[PDB]
Curated annotation (Swiss-Prot), chain A:
Functional description taken from the UniProt entry: Produces ATP from ADP in the presence of a proton gradient across the membrane. The alpha chain is a regulatory subunit.
Subunit relationships: F-type ATPases have 2 components, CF(1) - the catalytic core - and CF(0) - the membrane proton channel. CF(1) has five subunits: alpha(3), beta(3), gamma(1), delta(1), epsilon(1). CF(0) has three main subunits: a(1), b(2) and c(9-12). The alpha and beta chains form an alternating ring which encloses part of the gamma chain. CF(1) is attached to CF(0) by a central stalk formed by the gamma and epsilon chains, while a peripheral stalk is formed by the delta and b chains.
Part of the intact protein present: 295 to 368 of 514
The name this protein goes by in its record: ATP synthase subunit alpha
Cellular compartments annotated: Cell inner membrane
Swiss-Prot record, chain B:
Species of origin: Acinetobacter baumannii (strain ATCC 17978 / DSM 105126 / CIP 53.77 / LMG 1025 / NCDC KC755 / 5377)
Role description: Produces ATP from ADP in the presence of a proton gradient across the membrane.
Cell location: Cell inner membrane
Family note: Belongs to the ATPase epsilon chain family.
Gene label: atpC
Top-level taxonomic group: Bacteria
Subunit structure comment from the entry: F-type ATPases have 2 components, CF(1) - the catalytic core - and CF(0) - the membrane proton channel. CF(1) has five subunits: alpha(3), beta(3), gamma(1), delta(1), epsilon(1). CF(0) has three main subunits: a, b and c.
Protein name as annotated: ATP synthase epsilon chain
Length: 74, 69
């Protein structure tokens, strides 16, 4: 998972200028990722979710009890 | 008053002497008010606080009852 998620980044104008040999001088690139994981009964202590939480820059927890109660998104 | 018995029915009677007995009625007032204050200090602190904490998070335990992981 690490060598997959670590590719999503933002590169400086120098890198993009070097990559295109001077065609795109001004700007800067980027790439955003939104990996999706599913947990069993809210057990975020499992193996794969623990690995993935460590790598990403955040998370957005969606709850079932909040979903039924009408709060959508949860 | 009766030939052998005198009965005095008083709205508020205190056994002390002078006219300034508000200065001694205030002691009973303050003591009873302090007791009534500390009571409500114990009703919330002991009963209503703990008895909601116990019932707070039971559902998180009952759902994982059958899991073998």
């Amino acid at each position: 998972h690490s060598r997959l998620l670590e590719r999503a980044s933002r590169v400086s104008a120098e890198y993009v200028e070097k990559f295109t040999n001077g065609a795109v001088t001004g700007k800067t690139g980027s790439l955003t990722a939104l990996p999706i994981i599913e947990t069993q009964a809210g057990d975020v202590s499992a193996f794969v979710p623990t690995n993935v939480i460590s790598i990403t820059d955040g998370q957005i927890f969606l709850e079932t009890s909040l979903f039924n109660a009408g709060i959508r998104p949860a | 008053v009766q030939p052998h018995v005198v009965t005095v029915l008083a709205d508020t009677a205190i056994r002390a002497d002078n006219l300034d007995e508000a200065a001694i009625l205030e002691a009973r007032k303050n003591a009873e008010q302090l007791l009534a204050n500390q009571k409500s200090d114990l009703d919330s602190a002991a009963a209503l606080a703990a008895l909601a904490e116990t019932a707070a998070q039971l559902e998180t335990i009952r759902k994982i009852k059958n899991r073998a992981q």
